[PDB]
Design an enzyme around this catalytic site. Structure first.
Site, mmCIF file in Angstrom:
data_model
loop_
_atom_site.group_PDB
_atom_site.id
_atom_site.type_symbol
_atom_site.label_atom_id
_atom_site.label_comp_id
_atom_site.label_asym_id
_atom_site.label_seq_id
_atom_site.Cartn_x
_atom_site.Cartn_y
_atom_site.Cartn_z
ATOM 1 N N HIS A 12 0.798 -1.252 0.000
ATOM 2 C CA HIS A 12 0.000 0.000 0.000
ATOM 3 C C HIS A 12 0.824 1.294 0.000
ATOM 4 C CE1 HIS A 12 -3.650 -2.283 0.361
ATOM 5 N NE2 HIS A 12 -3.230 -2.845 1.501
ATOM 6 N N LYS A 39 -4.700 -9.966 -7.235
ATOM 7 C CA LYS A 39 -5.562 -9.177 -6.316
ATOM 8 C C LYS A 39 -6.589 -8.424 -7.178
ATOM 9 C CE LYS A 39 -4.780 -6.780 -1.892
ATOM 10 N NZ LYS A 39 -3.796 -6.075 -1.023
ATOM 11 N N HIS A 113 -3.095 -2.133 8.059
ATOM 12 C CA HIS A 113 -4.221 -2.546 7.187
ATOM 13 C C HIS A 113 -4.784 -1.302 6.493
ATOM 14 C CE1 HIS A 113 -7.954 -4.466 5.853
ATOM 15 N NE2 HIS A 113 -8.617 -3.467 6.474
#
Ligand SMILES: [Pt+2]
Ligand SMILES: [Pt+2]
Ligand SMILES: [Pt+2]
Length: 121
Positions: A12, A39, A113
């Protein structure tokens, strides 16, 4: 054990990407190991790492829903969306560049996350 933070950065974070086109998504998704299987959707945050870490403090974050934090500052982002198709390579992606705040989960003061649901649209 900051391994979840290091994995967050792998999945990310891209400090200065250059072009944020379809070719960028196909290349970074391979580079970061996100194509076995493909993904379906993945967002990269751009800019300074210290700003992303600050989301876990009142310095740049608010509490959000049950267990998340949402940033006070906006970030350059690029969302990679799988076109089709197959769960296995080659993985073709569409890039959408954006600029908004981000939703994360924090552990021991570090992001671990990214909530993808705000980038589904
Ligand atoms: Pt992973
Ligand atoms: Pt498509
Ligand atoms: Pt198509």
């Amino acid at each position: 054990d900051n391994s979840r933070y290091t994995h967050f950065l792998t999945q990310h974070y891209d400090a200065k990407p250059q072009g944020r086109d379809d070719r960028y998504c196909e290349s970074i998704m391979r580079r970061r190991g996100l194509t076995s299987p493909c993904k379906d959707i993945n967002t990269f945050i751009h800019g300074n790492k210290r700003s992303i870490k600050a989301i876990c403090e009142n310095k740049n974050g608010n509490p959000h829903r049950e267990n998340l934090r949402i940033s006070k500052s906006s970030f350059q982002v690029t969302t990679c969306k799988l076109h089709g198709g197959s769960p296995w390579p080659p993985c073709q992606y569409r890039a959408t560049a954006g600029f908004r705040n981000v939703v994360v989960a924090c552990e021991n003061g570090l992001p671990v996350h990214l909530d993808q649901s705000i980038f589904r649209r």
